[PDB]
Amino acid sequence: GASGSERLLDELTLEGVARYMQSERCRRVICLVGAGISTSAGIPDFRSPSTGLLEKYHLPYPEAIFEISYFKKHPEPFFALAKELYPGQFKPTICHYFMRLLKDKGLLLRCYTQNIDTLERIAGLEQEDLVEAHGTFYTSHCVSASCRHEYPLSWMKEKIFSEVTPKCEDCQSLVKPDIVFFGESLPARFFSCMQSDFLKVDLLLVMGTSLQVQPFASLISKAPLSTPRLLINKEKAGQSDPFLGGMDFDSKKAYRDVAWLGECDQGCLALAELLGWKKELEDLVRREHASIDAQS
Numbered sequence: 001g002a003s004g005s006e007r008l009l010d011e012l013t014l015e016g017v018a019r020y021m022q023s024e025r026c027r028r029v030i031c032l033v034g035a036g037i038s039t040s041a042g043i044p045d046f047r048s049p050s051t052g053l054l055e056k057y058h059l060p061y062p063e064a065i066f067e068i069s070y071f072k073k074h075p076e077p078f079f080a081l082a083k084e085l086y087p088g089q090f091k092p093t094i095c096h097y098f099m100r101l102l103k104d105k106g107l108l109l110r111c112y113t114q115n116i117d118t119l120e121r122i123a124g125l126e127q128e129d130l131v132e133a134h135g136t137f138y139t140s141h142c143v144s145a146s147c148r149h150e151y152p153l154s155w156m157k158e159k160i161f162s163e164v165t166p167k168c169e170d171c172q173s174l175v176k177p178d179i180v181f182f183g184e185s186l187p188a189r190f191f192s193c194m195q196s197d198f199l200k201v202d203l204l205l206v207m208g209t210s211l212q213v214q215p216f217a218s219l220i221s222k223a224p225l226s227t228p229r230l231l232i233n234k235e236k237a238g239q240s241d242p243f244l245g246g247m248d249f250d251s252k253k254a255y256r257d258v259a260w261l262g263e264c265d266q267g268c269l270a271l272a273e274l275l276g277w278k279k280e281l282e283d284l285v286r287r288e289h290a291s292i293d294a295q296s
């Protein structure tokens with residue numbers, strides 16, 4: 001039920017969420033994550049103005065570089081932009097490894113991500129664990145329907161840096177990263193998984209997303225009425241627009257939604273510490289970071 005029935009959280013705080021998580025009531029967690037979980041890895045949110053998408057690629061207009069139609073006839077700008085924005089290193093954040101701990105602890109049902117940077121995979125989430133709602137750079141495909149040859153990121157990276165427009169070795173068609181361009185539908189996996197997972201969820205962990213991009217944002221409304229929802233984000237997000245239901249953190253009717261405001265790494269660290277996981281998290285991160293730093 002809603003605010004009229006027995007609530008699952010004993011209090012609407014990070015401390016209440018932690019007690020809930022270590023109770024028998026909470027077995028299956030869905031993470032919903034966005035660009036906010038990767039900024040501390042040095043990957044800007046290209047939707048944040050302070051980063052902002054300087055682009056004299058001589059486009060007929062700015063949005064074209066995001067459009068699938070334009071890409072297919074003029075791919076060079078996109079791949080030039082891809083070389084410019086290519087991360088200098090792929091080191092997942094404390095937040096990413098917190099989700100790996102969730103997996104290790106048997107609590108992770110699914111991570112739905114809006115990010116295309118592959119850090120969830122590098123952190124040790126497996127394909128079965130992931131719904132990459134906006135696609136990913138991890139794999140690319142020949143765009144010809146009769147071919148659709150798949151290429152790994154290692155192949156696409158070399159093409160991007162060598163500034164050679166990637167073409168299929170089998171048919172010489174364009175090869176496109178598996179990211180969702182404007183004009184493309186979200187992956188079928190998104191809708192298939194959503195239909196099943198939200199029947200099974202005990203906790204929504206919403207991290208590093210302002211829940212402004214649809215249909216990803218609508219995911220929070222697919223939770224059962226009783227399911228607690230914890231937002232870890234720099235700003236409060238997900239409340240209904242008073243002009244145009246969503247999160248209710250602060251009203252007298254609030255019963256299940258909690259907002260922890262700050263950096264995602266710091267919120268996840270705080271939650272891990274409550275859970276008694278801080279040493280485990282520290283050890284995992286320092287080990288994986290050391291390994292990545294030492295890549296030779």
Ligand SMILES: Cc1cc(C)nc(SCC(=O)Nc2cccc(COc3ccccc3)c2)n1
Binds near residue numbers: 179
């Ligand atoms: C493995 C890996 C490799 C790379 C090139 N980038 C990343 S993450 C950093 C990042 O944002 N990169 C990037 C590259 C190109 C375009 C855009 C944004 O424009 C679009 C255009 C169409 C669909 C979606 C987004 C962003 N990760």
Ligand SMILES: [Zn+2]
Binds near residue numbers: 142143169170171
């Ligand atoms: Zn092909």
